[PDB]
Amino acid sequence: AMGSMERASLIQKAKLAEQAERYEDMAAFMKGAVEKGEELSCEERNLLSVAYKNVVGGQRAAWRVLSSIEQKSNGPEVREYREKVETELQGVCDTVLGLLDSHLIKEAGDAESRVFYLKMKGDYYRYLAEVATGDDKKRIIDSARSAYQEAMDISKKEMPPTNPIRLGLALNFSVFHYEIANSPEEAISLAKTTFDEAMADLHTLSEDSYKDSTLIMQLLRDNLTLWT
Amino acid sequence: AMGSMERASLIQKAKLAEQAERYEDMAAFMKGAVEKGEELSCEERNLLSVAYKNVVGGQRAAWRVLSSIEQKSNGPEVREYREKVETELQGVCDTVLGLLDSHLIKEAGDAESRVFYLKMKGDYYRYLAEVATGDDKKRIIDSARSAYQEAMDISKKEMPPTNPIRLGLALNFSVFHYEIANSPEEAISLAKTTFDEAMADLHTLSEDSYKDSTLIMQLLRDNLTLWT
Numbered sequence: 001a002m003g004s005m006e007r008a009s010l011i012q013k014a015k016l017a018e019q020a021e022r023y024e025d026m027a028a029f030m031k032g033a034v035e036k037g038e039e040l041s042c043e044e045r046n047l048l049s050v051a052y053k054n055v056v057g058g059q060r061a062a063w064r065v066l067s068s069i070e071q072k073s074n075g076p077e078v079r080e081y082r083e084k085v086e087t088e089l090q091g092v093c094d095t096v097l098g099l100l101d102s103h104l105i106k107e108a109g110d111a112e113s114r115v116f117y118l119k120m121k122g123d124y125y126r127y128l129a130e131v132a133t134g135d136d137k138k139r140i141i142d143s144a145r146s147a148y149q150e151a152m153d154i155s156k157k158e159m160p161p162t163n164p165i166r167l168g169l170a171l172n173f174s175v176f177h178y179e180i181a182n183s184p185e186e187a188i189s190l191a192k193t194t195f196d197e198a199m200a201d202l203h204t205l206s207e208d209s210y211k212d213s214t215l216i217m218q219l220l221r222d223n224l225t226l227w228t
Numbered sequence: 229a230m231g232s233m234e235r236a237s238l239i240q241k242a243k244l245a246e247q248a249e250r251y252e253d254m255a256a257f258m259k260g261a262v263e264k265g266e267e268l269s270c271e272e273r274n275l276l277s278v279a280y281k282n283v284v285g286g287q288r289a290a291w292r293v294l295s296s297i298e299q300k301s302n303g304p305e306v307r308e309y310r311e312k313v314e315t316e317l318q319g320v321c322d323t324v325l326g327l328l329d330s331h332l333i334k335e336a337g338d339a340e341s342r343v344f345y346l347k348m349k350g351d352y353y354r355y356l357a358e359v360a361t362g363d364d365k366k367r368i369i370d371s372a373r374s375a376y377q378e379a380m381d382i383s384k385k386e387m388p389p390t391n392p393i394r395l396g397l398a399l400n401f402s403v404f405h406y407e408i409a410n411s412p413e414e415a416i417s418l419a420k421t422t423f424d425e426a427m428a429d430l431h432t433l434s435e436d437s438y439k440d441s442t443l444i445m446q447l448l449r450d451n452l453t454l455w456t
């Protein structure tokens with residue numbers, strides 16, 4: 001549906017939708033922009049990520065509310081409506097995964113872009129995993145793992161330990177280990193090593209970069225406090 | 229689209245959507261329930277009102293953000309996107325007005341139901357008026373006025389001055405006068421007379437009714453403080 005709108009107008013409208021807190025519109029504008037076929041700049045990758053994280057965040061919050069109610073119940077209505085919200089969530093995740101596979105990741109050659117998109121691939125498979133069950137759950141969990149691991153391998157080779165994308169990737173992979181993979185020790189080890197290596201590299205940063213890095217290190221510390 | 233779902237299941241799902249903060253779903257479930265053709269109970273009228281007030285509230289907030297940006301700007305993109313949000317808002321208002329006209333108001337014979345639906349008719353014409361301009365704006369403003377006035381005439385004849393529906397109707401009609409009709413003196417007179425007549429009737433109320441009434445009287449007092 002956004003095929004007739006200029007790329008620059010889609011990006012401008014994504015920014016207006018963010019100001020208006022219209023995240024579904026923001027995601028549709030950014031999907032339109034990706035579908036123009038050109039690579040995304042750093043600012044535009046962040047617009048894509050903010051749009052979809054807010055849309056899926058709403059769906060995840062609702063799914064948790066409904067799943068809770070359903071668990072306590074255990075007519076068909078709660079299960080039906082939880083399944084409706086679940087399907088809509090799966091559709092948003094599949095859309096994002098589709099944009100990454102067609103063709104954002106394959107054209108991303110710089111570390112900052114390739115790590116960003118692989119982290120996104122891990123996060124959306126992780127959201128699919130939260131609602132998955134059984135073996136289905138296993139192949140989805142391994143997809144999330146694989147994407148996070150490739151991103152980590154690149155980030156460790158190509159970025160300093162304070163780089164915010166590297167820090168956020170490590171934060172979310174630690175969450176994957178604690179909440180999805182039933183590996184709390186791996187989660188704690190990852191968050192602690194990430195935190196310690198960033199602290200040792202802070203002396204290299206300007207005031208503004210220091211603020212960016214320490215904000216995410218505080219997220220790692222908040223989890224380590226929750227987990228220990 | 230809700231034609232195949234039982235009325236009771238639509239109401240149950242509206243309540244689940246409210247818990248999940250899924251207001252668009254809640255509005256669609258309640259639209260489905262109205263379209264079954266049966267009158268709505270007090271609880272169900274309140275579900276209808278909560279659903280649509282939250283959906284239109286989101287649209288109004290976005291419209292104000294975009295209109296502000298547009299005013300400061302004065303390419304086509306801001307105007308285009310403000311118009312998109314405006315059209316979607318107008319559509320929600322027209323949907324609500326349609327449900328009231330087909331056939332909620334005509335079947336509503338009790339004061340509590342008829343005043344509730346006429347107040348709703350005033351509020352949704354008032355939302356249309358907020359985005360209207362010119363003469364178009366005049367006929368919409370008079371529709372809102374007419375609906376509020378019929379509700380007020382019934383409420384004054386049939387309900388005590390502390391009745392929360394009567395109080396909320398007077399609150400919103402005062403807002404209509406201050407914000408839409410450019411009649412701040414009528415707004416202040418209405419809110420003050422409403423407040424004073426309710427205060428004089430509080431002695432008749434139980435503890436729980438007193439809490440319900442005084443909550444809305446505090447809203448009248450908050451406006452009177454903003455307006456004087």
Ligand SMILES: O=C(COc1ccccc1P(=O)(O)O)Nc1cccc(C(F)(F)F)c1
Nearest residue numbers: 056057058060061062064123171172175219
């Ligand atoms: O509360 C959180 C914390 O999650 C994270 C913490 C650190 C890093 C990454 C995440 P996330 O990608 O799981 O959102 N996420 C979240 C995000 C959106 C919605 C809900 C809800 F509780 F409502 F389901 C939870």
Ligand SMILES: O=C(COc1ccccc1P(=O)(O)O)Nc1cccc(C(F)(F)F)c1
Nearest residue numbers: 284285286288289290292351399400403447
């Ligand atoms: O802040 C308000 C206060 O409005 C009222 C006050 C008393 C009685 C009725 C109303 P309302 O029916 O105009 O919402 N309404 C409102 C409701 C939703 C959204 C926005 C936004 F500022 F974001 F556009 C404003």
Ligand SMILES: [Cl-]
Nearest residue numbers: 080081084241
């Ligand atoms: Cl459903």
Ligand SMILES: [Cl-]
Nearest residue numbers: 080083084087
């Ligand atoms: Cl289905």
Ligand SMILES: [Cl-]
Nearest residue numbers: 106107108109
């Ligand atoms: Cl490449």
Ligand SMILES: [Cl-]
Nearest residue numbers: 013308309312
């Ligand atoms: Cl638009």
Ligand SMILES: [Cl-]
Nearest residue numbers: 308311312315
């Ligand atoms: Cl158009």
Ligand SMILES: [Cl-]
Nearest residue numbers: 334335336337
């Ligand atoms: Cl009647």
Ligand SMILES: [Mg+2]
Nearest residue numbers: 005006007008
């Ligand atoms: Mg072009």
Ligand SMILES: [Mg+2]
Nearest residue numbers: 082083086087
């Ligand atoms: Mg399912």
Ligand SMILES: [Mg+2]
Nearest residue numbers: 039107108109
């Ligand atoms: Mg490239």
Ligand SMILES: [Mg+2]
Nearest residue numbers: 233234235236
């Ligand atoms: Mg039936």
Ligand SMILES: [Mg+2]
Nearest residue numbers: 310311314315
């Ligand atoms: Mg228009």
Ligand SMILES: [Mg+2]
Nearest residue numbers: 267335336337
């Ligand atoms: Mg009747």
